[PDB]
Amino acid sequence: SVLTMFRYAGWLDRLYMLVGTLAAIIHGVALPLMMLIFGDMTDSFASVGQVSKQSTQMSEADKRAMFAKLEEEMTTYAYYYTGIGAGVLIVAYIQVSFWALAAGRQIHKIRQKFFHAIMNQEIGWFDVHDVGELNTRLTDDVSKINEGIGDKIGMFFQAMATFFGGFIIGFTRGWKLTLVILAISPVLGLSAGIWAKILSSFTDKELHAYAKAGAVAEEVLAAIRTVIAFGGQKKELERYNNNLEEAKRLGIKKAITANISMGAAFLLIYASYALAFWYGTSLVISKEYSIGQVLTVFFSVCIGAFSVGQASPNIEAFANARGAAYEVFKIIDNKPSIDSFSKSGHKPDNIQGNLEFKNIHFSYPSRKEVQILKGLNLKVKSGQTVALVGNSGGGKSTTVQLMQRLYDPLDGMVSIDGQDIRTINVRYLREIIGVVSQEPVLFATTIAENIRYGREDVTMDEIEKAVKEANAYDFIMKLPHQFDTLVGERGAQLSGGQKQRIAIARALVRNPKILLLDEATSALDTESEAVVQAALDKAREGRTTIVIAHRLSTVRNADVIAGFDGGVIVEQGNHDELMREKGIYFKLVMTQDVPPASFWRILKLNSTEWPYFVVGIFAAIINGGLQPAFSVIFSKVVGVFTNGGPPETQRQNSNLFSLLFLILGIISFITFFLQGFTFGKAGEILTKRLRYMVFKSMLRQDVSWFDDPKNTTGALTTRLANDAAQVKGATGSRLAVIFQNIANLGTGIIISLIYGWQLTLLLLAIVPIIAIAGVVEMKMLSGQALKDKKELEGSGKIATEAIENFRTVVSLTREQKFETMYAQSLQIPYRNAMKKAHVFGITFSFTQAMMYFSYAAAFRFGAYLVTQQLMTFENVLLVFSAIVFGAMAVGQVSSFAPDYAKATVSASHIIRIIEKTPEIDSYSTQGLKPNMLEGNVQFSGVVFNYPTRPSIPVLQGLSLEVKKGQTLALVGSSGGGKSTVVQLLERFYDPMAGSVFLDGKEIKQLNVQWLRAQLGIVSQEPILFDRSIAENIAYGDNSRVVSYEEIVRAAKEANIHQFIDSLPDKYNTRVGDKGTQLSGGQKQRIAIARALVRQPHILLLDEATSALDTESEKVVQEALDKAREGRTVIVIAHRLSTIQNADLIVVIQNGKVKEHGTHQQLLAQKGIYFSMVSVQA
């Protein structure tokens, strides 16, 4: 329906809308009512009040009185203008404030419930829809709903009230003439309706394009590190630019439709005027009407017609809001099958850990032609440990996901204590299960707050106990702020092992009955793995654990071990029995602040399209000056009309004025369309350019910039969209009409001046008082613009953090907590909106009241002028019309002050991002680019401290050397700085002391893009894009077009080609967001292929085999050994099997080197390396 919105009105918002509509009706009819009650000079309101001479014999006494009686009438009308002005003050304040309050409350509820619809969806829903658009929706569509259900509805109702009041006055003075002119009401209405429907469709398409553009920006900014490492800034900007172009085209179409609607309305009105004079000239010839009769009905219908003509932007805003309310309410109305918010379902008192998987058949929703499990059967007894082993992609993580009811199996049963889990309450089932995922993800908050996400009502003592069990106490105590040290998005400001241990503690603070641990020790060293294993063993008896580990040391002591082959368990049993059977387990085990000109400079960025601007200015001047010139030309029109010579022939011969009104309608159509279309196209080009430049500037910035807690994905994505939209809100047709109004005021100045100069001083006085309300509102609103921008950045941060990490939120049952945080983040903008409602209501009220007071003052001063014979009554009526139009112009400019307020704050910020220069500039062409590279990498006394934690020494005089054909093995404990070396070699940061040399040349002198071009890195937690497999390997070289054969060769070297070939759609298969749609090993192998397709001279691996099986690791090692010569390789490994083949191994701890040499040399001495290899054995 059209009215899907206003669903969350409630009684208070209904009462606001009803009383505001009543106030709008009263305010609209109050001007018709004045002329209805008082009509003796309403006939005079037809200018050139015909006196029919009578001045030949004016007694100067008969003349005298006449002027005194006329003065008395003007004074009475001035008093009534003052009274109507006070009434207008009250009713206009009510009309604006009530509608704004209702819109604000409804928008607050809409945002809250749209957030409580994304959190309610299933994981399968998230695996099919592009959820990277959703935040843009929350930032944009709702805002466009806010712009179409507030003040605009009241304004439209006021215009309608003026329309009906004017037509009621005509009916009183001429039923037939009014009925014929009213014949354009249905055609005008249908025109408005069709244009509104087209506007709604175009708005829906444009918002879809903007949502797609926001999704690219969400993916790229969340993966800026991969984007910078592989130099994909140009490609990621082209991807953004494509959706920017689509949105610009749709917006240009929107501008065309809206302005042709405006022009068509004005053309219809002017054609109706010509029809009115036609039929009235008939009524006069046939003698059934007088001239006064046709003039009055005209003045009465004209005001309402022009009010409706001016009401078109309100209809456009309503159409845009209804177009924006499509996807939001579509997502809201969607009801999941697995409802985590449902209260139904059994919550058994005594959950004994009896887990059964019976004939489990499952296929993922995104890839539903692939069978992952084919009659999986597995029984886990209370207090027992099952260890799931097998090849990568077999379905172990799928089984873990099915245990926590992330999906429902197509066939089979998952049961606890013999009870089917689809009948258990979803939330209750999930709280009794604690899960550590294959690649743990933290949240952008403190360590303690991250732990509290496992269980909200947790004390500091139990947090300490859990982090001691997780072997996390030591490093948390070591860095300052203790538990209050905030980590980055997804835990990026911690080492991989630290993040994994934090996740372990977060799962442990739940005291779960079912502990799922999927590769929970992949980022840990031998000591941390051993101590965490012992801590878990000390608590096994009370709970049941399902553990999946590619490190076969942990599964040695498991009570039962189950092997996956072909989607089923082929061998289940203990270690000794499986070794006796010599099955797949045996095979696995053997193979071992605000400048005020900011808007001016943003518009100066729009200088290329100056011809559009000049055409729009000319059109705005034409229509704005024709608005008051209407009174003058009708004065001349009235002149001849009233003049009667021959009775019938010449009166009908005066059809030239119907032609004049037709020409005026054509000119109005052309000028309104031109002005609006040119300004809207200029605004579309400007907003697209601003988004392009801001996104390019963000991709230019350093890694340290992205590590700033204020610069989070959600914050950045909100900042970009919000600044572009806020600047756009003060440009386009909104700007165009402003120029028109200036022209109007200018014309009002000249028409008065050529007709009477005494009344011009009244305009010169009343402009300041009608603009003081605007400037004081511009002030009040300017500071809360900054405040609301800062709060909306945090709201977007919370929303994006919840969306990008929805699986973690669902596993932790933290959807309600994130909803509470989102609601809290909305409170300050909500209260600011509620107070802005009253501020805008008072501003509009004061403006209209001073307009009416200006009319009263005009009538009184004109009475003085007429009494002293200084000026005539025809002149005081023409100029009074000029004063009315000038007051309108000043009032509308003052109403533009809120739009410009947001624009200037946003401009001062768009200008700054754009002019910001990073220290390590990746766009700079400067820098020495060596013609040859020999692969000699040296670190000399490198000292580095991370910008977000500058007081913690990370590397202290680190020195190392690696040459071509040599393999450097970085080993050591978690947090020692192994990944920091790789990040420094990529020049993500610059060390304060020491140097990094490439072939004897210090790396800060080399070109940054050139230096990164010869680096091929596999990261510790590899990130892929939601793009094809082939597109992901090809990101390994963005400079050239990578061929299909090269991609296939890289995949074969990465031992991933067979999976891609077997999978339907092959290399065109989309992986999901950050490799969600592939197993950890498959994702890591695709990352390896991405790094290898580049054929780098320097290959940096950061635990590149953590998620790989023994066979896959062997294949990758053989592939690397085949190409061992011809490049230099630096490997970070927690597995001694890969390390023992390295040419040289260095043990780095606390940023220093302790032991270095070959495997035999390190083994000879009983040092750290010997201790590690002995504890492993």
Ligand X SMILES: CC(C)CCC[C@@H](C)[C@H]1CC[C@H]2[C@@H]3CC=C4C[C@@H](OC(=O)CCC(=O)O)CC[C@]4(C)[C@H]3CC[C@]12C
Ligand Y SMILES: *SC[C@@H]1NC(=O)c2csc(n2)[C@H](C)NC(=O)c2csc(n2)[C@H](C)NC(=O)c2csc1n2
Tell me which residues touch ligand X (CB under 6 A).
Answer: 3, 6-7, 9, 14, 17, 75, 78-79, 82, 90, 94, 101, 105, 153, 156, 164, 167, 185-186, 189-190, 193-194, 197, 314-315, 318, 762, 765-766, 769, 831, 834, 853-854, 856-857, 860-861, 864
How many whole angstroms from its chain centre is CA 620?
Answer: 33
- DSSP codes of every residue in 281-307: HHHHHTTSS-HHHHHHHHHHHHHHHHH
Residue of the chain from 32, 85, 394, 1096 that contacts ligand ATP (CB under 6 A): 394
Q: Is 45 in the site for ligand Y (CB under 6 A)?
A: yes
Q: Is 853 in the site for ligand Y (CB under 6 A)?
A: no
- Tokens 């009014």 belong to which residue? 178
Residue of the chain from 829, 1080, 1096, 1151 that contacts Mg ion (CB under 5 A): 1080
What does the per-residue mask of binding to ligand Y show for 356-385, with x meaning CB under 6 A?
------------------------------
Nearest to 1102 by CA among 936, 988, 934: 988
Q: Is 884 in the site for ligand Y (CB under 6 A)?
A: yes
Nearer to ligand ATP, 698 or 849 (CB): 698
Length of the chain: 1177
Residue of the chain from 75, 334, 354, 948 that contacts ligand ATP (CB under 6 A): 948
Residue of the chain from 106, 162, 450, 811 that contacts ligand Y (CB under 6 A): 162
Residues 467-496 within binding reach of Mg ion (CB under 5 A): 495-496
Residue 961 to residue 975: CA distance in whole angstroms: 21
Residue 769 to residue 853: CA distance in whole angstroms: 11
- DSSP codes of every residue in 880-947: HHHHHHHHHHHHHHHHTHHHHHHHHHHHHHHHHHHH---SS-SS---SB--S-----EEEEEEEE--T
Q: How many CB atoms neighbour CB 466 within 10 A?
A: 25
Nearer to ligand X, 145 or 603 (CB): 145
- Give the H or E element holding residue 563: strand 560-565
Residue 118 to residue 798: CA distance in whole angstroms: 13
Q: Are 880 and 763 in contact (CB under 8 A)?
A: no
Q: Is 974 in the site for ligand ATP (CB under 6 A)?
A: yes
Contacts of residues 705-712 at CB distance under 8 Å and 24 or more positions apart, as own/partner, are 705/918, 706/221, 706/224, 706/225, 707/488, 707/492, 707/493, 707/946, 707/947, 707/948, 708/948, 709/444, 709/486, 709/488, 709/948, 710/793, 712/444, 712/489, 712/797, 712/800, 712/801
Residues 1012-1041 within binding reach of Mg ion (CB under 5 A): 1020
Nearer to ligand X, 489 or 819 (CB): 819
Residue of the chain from 393, 512, 729, 732 that contacts ligand ATP (CB under 6 A): 393
Residue 1023 to residue 1035: CA distance in whole angstroms: 12
Tokens representing 474?
């030591």
* Beta carbon of residue 436, minimum distance to Mg ion (angstroms, whole number): 12
Residue 667 to residue 210: CA distance in whole angstroms: 35
Nearer to ligand Y, 627 or 845 (CB): 627
Nearer to ligand Y, 384 or 631 (CB): 631
Q: Is 26 in the site for ligand Y (CB under 6 A)?
A: no
Nearer to Mg ion, 139 or 1020 (CB): 1020
189 binds, among ligand ATP, ligand X, Mg ion, none (CB under 5 to 8 A by kind): ligand X
CA distances from 1040 to 128, 1036, 1037, 1094 (A): 31, 10, 6, 10
Q: Which residue is nearest to ligand Y (CB)?
A: 302
Q: Is 520 in the site for ligand ATP (CB under 6 A)?
A: no
Sheet holding 411-416, edge to edge: 373-380, 355-362, 411-416, 419-420
Nearer to ligand ATP, 243 or 495 (CB): 495
Nearer to Mg ion, 794 or 1075 (CB): 1075
Per rule CB under 5 A, count of chain residues that contact Mg ion: 8
CA dihedral 662, 665, 666, 668 (to 10 degrees): 160
Regarding beta strands 411-416 and 560-565, do their DSSP bridges make them parallel or antiparallel, or are they unpaired? unpaired
Nearer to Mg ion, 598 or 1020 (CB): 1020
For residue 106, what are the contacts with CB-CB under 8 A and spacing of at least 6? 5, 6, 8, 9, 13, 149
* Beta carbon of residue 180, minimum distance to ligand Y (angstroms, whole number): 17
Q: Is 920 in the site for ligand ATP (CB under 6 A)?
A: no
153 binds, among ligand X, ligand Y, Mg ion, none (CB under 5 to 8 A by kind): ligand X
Query: Could you write out the three-class secondary structure of 451-479?
Result: HHCCCCCCCHHHHHHHHHHCCCHHHHHHC
Phi, psi of 750 (to 5 degrees): -80, -45
Residue of the chain from 881, 1038, 1069, 1138 that contacts ligand Y (CB under 6 A): 881
Give per-residue burial for 505-533: e unless 16+ CB within 10 Å, then b: bbbbbbbbbbbbbbbbbbbbbbebbbebb
Amino acid, res. 653:
N
585 binds, among Mg ion, ligand ATP, ligand X, none (CB under 5 to 8 A by kind): none
CA distances from 921 to 553, 987, 1004 (A): 46, 10, 11
* Beta carbon of residue 878, minimum distance to ligand Y (angstroms, whole number): 8
79 binds, among ligand ATP, ligand X, Mg ion, none (CB under 5 to 8 A by kind): ligand X
* Beta carbon of residue 779, minimum distance to ligand ATP (angstroms, whole number): 41
What does the per-residue mask of binding to ligand Y show for 630-669, with x meaning CB under 6 A?
xx--------------------------------------
Residue of the chain from 135, 438, 498, 1128 that contacts Mg ion (CB under 5 A): 438
Residue 803 to residue 117: CA distance in whole angstroms: 11
* Beta carbon of residue 465, minimum distance to ligand ATP (angstroms, whole number): 22
Quick one: which segment of 334-342, 468-476, 624-632, 822-830 binds ligand Y (CB under 6 A)? 624-632
Q: Is 440 in the site for Mg ion (CB under 5 A)?
A: no
Quick one: which segment of 298-306, 350-358, 485-493, 772-780 binds ligand Y (CB under 6 A)? 298-306
Nearest to 319 by CA among 215, 211, 207, 210: 207
* Beta carbon of residue 744, minimum distance to ligand Y (angstroms, whole number): 10
Residues 105-134 within binding reach of ligand ATP (CB under 6 A): 127
* Beta carbon of residue 224, minimum distance to ligand ATP (angstroms, whole number): 12
Nearer to ligand X, 64 or 912 (CB): 64
- Give the H or E element holding residue 264: helix 233-285
Q: Is 1081 in the site for ligand ATP (CB under 6 A)?
A: yes
Residue of the chain from 148, 665, 796, 977 that contacts ligand ATP (CB under 6 A): 977
Q: Is 1082 in the site for ligand ATP (CB under 6 A)?
A: yes
Residues 531-560 within binding reach of ligand Y (CB under 6 A): none
Q: Is 296 in the site for ligand Y (CB under 6 A)?
A: no
Tokens representing 523?
């980022």
Quick one: which segment of 129-137, 242-250, 304-312, 506-514 binds ligand Y (CB under 6 A)? 304-312
Q: Are 712 and 801 in contact (CB under 8 A)?
A: yes
Return the DSSP state at 1071: P
Q: Is 1078 in the site for ligand ATP (CB under 6 A)?
A: yes
193 binds, among Mg ion, ligand ATP, ligand X, none (CB under 5 to 8 A by kind): ligand X
Residues 694-723 within binding reach of ligand ATP (CB under 6 A): 707
Residue 254 to residue 789: CA distance in whole angstroms: 27
- DSSP codes of every residue in 133-166: GHHHHHHHHHHHHHTTSSHHHHHHHHHHHHHHHH
Contacts to ligand Y by CB under 6 A: 31, 45, 162, 302-303, 306-307, 310, 627, 630-631, 855, 881, 884
Contacts to ligand ATP by CB under 6 A: 127, 364, 366-367, 372, 392-398, 438, 488, 492-498, 523, 707, 946, 948-949, 954, 972, 974-980, 1020, 1072, 1076-1082, 1107
